[PDB]
Amino acid sequence: EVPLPQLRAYTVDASWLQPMAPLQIADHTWQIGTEDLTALLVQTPDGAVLLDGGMPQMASHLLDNMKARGVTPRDLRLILLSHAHADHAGPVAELKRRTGAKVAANAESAVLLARGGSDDLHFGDGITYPPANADRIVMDGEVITVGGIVFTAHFMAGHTPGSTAWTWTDTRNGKPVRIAYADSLSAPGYQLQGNPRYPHLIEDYRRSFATVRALPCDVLLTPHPGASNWDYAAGARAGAKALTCKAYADAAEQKFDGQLAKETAG
Ligand SMILES: O=C(O)c1c(-c2ccccc2)oc(-c2ccccc2)c1C(=O)O
Numbered sequence: 001e002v003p004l005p006q007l008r009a010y011t012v013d014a015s016w017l018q019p020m021a022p023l024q025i026a027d028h029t030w031q032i033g034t035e036d037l038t039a040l041l042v043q044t045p046d047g048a049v050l051l052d053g054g055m056p057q058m059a060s061h062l063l064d065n066m067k068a069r070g071v072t073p074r075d076l077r078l079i080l081l082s083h084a085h086a087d088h089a090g091p092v093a094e095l096k097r098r099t100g101a102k103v104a105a106n107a108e109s110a111v112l113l114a115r116g117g118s119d120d121l122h123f124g125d126g127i128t129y130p131p132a133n134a135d136r137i138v139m140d141g142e143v144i145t146v147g148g149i150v151f152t153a154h155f156m157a158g159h160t161p162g163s164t165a166w167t168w169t170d171t172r173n174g175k176p177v178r179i180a181y182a183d184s185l186s187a188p189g190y191q192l193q194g195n196p197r198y199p200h201l202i203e204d205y206r207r208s209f210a211t212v213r214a215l216p217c218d219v220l221l222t223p224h225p226g227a228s229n230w231d232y233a234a235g236a237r238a239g240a241k242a243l244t245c246k247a248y249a250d251a252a253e254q255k256f257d258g259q260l261a262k263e264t265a266g
């Protein structure tokens with residue numbers, strides 16, 4: 001007699017869990033996550049913003065990196081998200097408890113976050129994390145301003161219903177740098193065609209390729225840094241091979257077209 005299987009925790013490559021010191025992207029913007037998961041701190045004269053936190057277990061590390069940058073728990077005003085999967089929104093509930101941060105997100109991301117990632121359209125209850133509530137709901141193209149860094153939301157549904165690119169203008173050497181944090185355009189293990197839980201999935205992805213291609217994009221960053229060819233562990237060379245938003249979108253569309261063909265064959 002065979003019992004039901006134990007629960008299996010989702011495990012990741014060691015580099016996804018490997019702490020790194022803050023890496024400066026532009027005058028106000030730093031990577032403060034691990035070697036292989038993005039978590040961006042944007043520091044202003046009127047508080048700080050975090051875009052993504054990575055996995056559930058990264059909360060204390062993020063807080064240590066914030067302190068190294070001079071940002072206290074009270075100083076963190078706002079959390080934004082690329083999308084609400086465990087590997088990017090992991091530690092959000094814990095950060096809200098340990099800091100002043102409030103969460104702004106679109107309705108789709110807020111609903112999935114409130115679920116802690118459960119009942120995912122594709123992963124089901126396979127990748128759950130602690131639930132969190134959003135404090136503010138944002139619409140496509142809506143702007144949020146903190147200390148004169150202006151973040152604009154660009155909905156790019158597909159990877160999740162609520163996938164979002166966040167764009168802002170920072171500086172380097174007194175010159176503007178248009179940063180684009182574009183969400184994932186992967187479909188890992190997804191049923192793409194005739195999916196009853198996401199009937200217009202393909203059309204949403206195609207529109208999202210177009211959105212990403214057109215973003216204001218001097219520097220592209222992605223939730224998984226490898227997708228945009230970042231190597232955070234390479235210090236001074238971390239961003240040298242980085243893709244343009246146009247190149248990222250083209251590569252993603254080519255991979256998606258291959259996946260569609262394999263699906264039809266399978
Ligand atoms: O966010 C996702 O859906 C992806 C995840 C993931 C999601 C939740 C928990 C653990 C991993 O891994 C990957 C991934 C796995 C291996 C290599 C690169 C990315 C994802 C992707 O392709 O977007």
Ligand SMILES: [Zn+2]
Nearest residue numbers: 083085159184
């Ligand atoms: Zn994801």
Ligand SMILES: [Zn+2]
Nearest residue numbers: 085087088223
């Ligand atoms: Zn991911």
